[PDB]
Design a protein around this ligand. Structure first.
Ligand code: NA
Length: 184
């Protein structure tokens, strides 16, 4: 049977605010036949709240030596004022926890488009440290941040607001995630 990929995160993993099927997770699920994606994303979620989601799943999870676990979070924490050290440290805890039940894939969260000279710098600092951690531990990374930054910079309409992708932004993210998921 299929591979299982379990996805955790906030509203940008859940797919706010487009029809079911058009968030990036769901695009990926419709694009790969023998990989089944389950979305545990939760709107409004903080990085510590995601840990709780992972724990509540992990205590019920069957052993599965081909499972992958996708994680991405921290935007809400950054919007509420937390610094890159807090966000990064808490994500590492999530990554260590998820690693006990599957092979982890890390997503680099997208830009804070309302504050490219303030809050977005925290996002960038988190993402640099994540790339360094993943290289050290041989964990796959999906760089969503770069995908949408480049597209928006050239004039593609990809954001519906200060952080949420629109449908175009979710398609571009799905393509970028598929570069990793397809090779598993
Ligand atoms: Na599928």
């Amino acid at each position: 049977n299929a591979m299982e990929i379990i996805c955790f995160g906030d509203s940008i993993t859940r797919g706010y605010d487009v029809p079911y099927g058009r968030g990036w997770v769901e695009i990926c699920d419709a694009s790969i036949e023998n990989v089944n994606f389950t979305n545990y994303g939760e709107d409004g979620c903080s990085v510590q709240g995601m840990i709780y989601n992972i724990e509540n799943w992990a205590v019920t999870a069957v052993s599965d030596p081909t499972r992958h676990i996708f994680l991405m979070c921290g935007t809400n924490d950054i919007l509420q004022g937390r610094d890159s050290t807090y966000v990064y440290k808490t994500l590492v805890k999530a990554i260590e926890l998820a690693s006990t039940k599957g092979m982890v894939i890390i997503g680099l969260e997208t830009q804070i488009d309302s504050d490219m000279d303030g809050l977005d710098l925290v996002v960038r600092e988190v993402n640099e440290q994540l790339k360094a951690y993943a290289a050290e531990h041989n964990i796959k990374v999906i760089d969503f941040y770069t995908t949408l930054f480049e597209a928006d910079q050239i004039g593609q309409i990809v954001f519906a607001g200060e952080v949420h992708p629109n449908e175009r932004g979710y398609r571009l993210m799905a393509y970028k995630a598929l570069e990793v998921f397809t090779r598993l």
